[PDB]
Amino acid sequence: KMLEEIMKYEASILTHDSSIRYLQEIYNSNNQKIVNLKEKVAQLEAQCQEPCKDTVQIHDITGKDCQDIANKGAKQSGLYFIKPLKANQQFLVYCEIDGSGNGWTVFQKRLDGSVDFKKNWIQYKEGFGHLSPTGTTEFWLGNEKIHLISTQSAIPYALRVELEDWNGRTSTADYAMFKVGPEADKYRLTYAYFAGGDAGDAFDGFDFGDDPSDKFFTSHNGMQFSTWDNDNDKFEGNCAEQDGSGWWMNKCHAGHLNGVYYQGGTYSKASTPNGYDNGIIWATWKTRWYSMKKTTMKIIPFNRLTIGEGQ
């Protein structure tokens, strides 16, 4: 097999040669793909450098309180930093701004029982719960901060309670010249008098019948703040510890907005631990055995209520 075996090979080098020029088409093409591929993922890397969007935004407008902020030109209810006159460090609060120009600075809200109010002293002094720009989260602002605002300038602040049963029926209750003392005064609570509001002056005490004394023993004006780890109540045995919350007891209460959250409203003596009522009650409006569905305590300069004029 001279020029026979070799005849089969002197041209068989052009047979397989169709895998050299051919296998450089791919290397020159694939290589190119990547060059741009690198470019592509580069655009991608660019796309993701930013962190998720936090729907919670804060407003750049500060003030001594929400009304002051409302004056500056705030139009929407949201979180804001306020620094009361005597205060050293500012803090976030939820401001409620209506179209009329009133700037309510809220210090308490219940709406789902999502947060436990069975908190100690410190906790009730510094604040707990969460702030949302949509006021759809329950919390407690903090005695200290409450004290600071209701005391700066010493100009008439008015308290407004807003309740709502499990039937979407609401009701207010106002109090003129509202104020809370310093820790040295165990953050005592005082108000000049009960203004309007269709919910009833529960702060004035209520007669539960059990005894003729109930009526005084359930008033809260002039009462100091109390927690399970800090008595200061008129009762000789600690309402706070029993009824499990933080409030201004006076041999307990008639109004109890930091009480246990009972779903549906109606509760009973058996449900409760010590047997006594501890729901979010507001006697002058519902029974001591009907815990509200929502609760809100906001404050605003009194003059924003007595009408008069404006300036």
Partner: peptide
């Protein structure tokens, strides 16, 4: 509430 009020107590005994």
């Amino acid at each position: 509430g009020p107590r005994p």
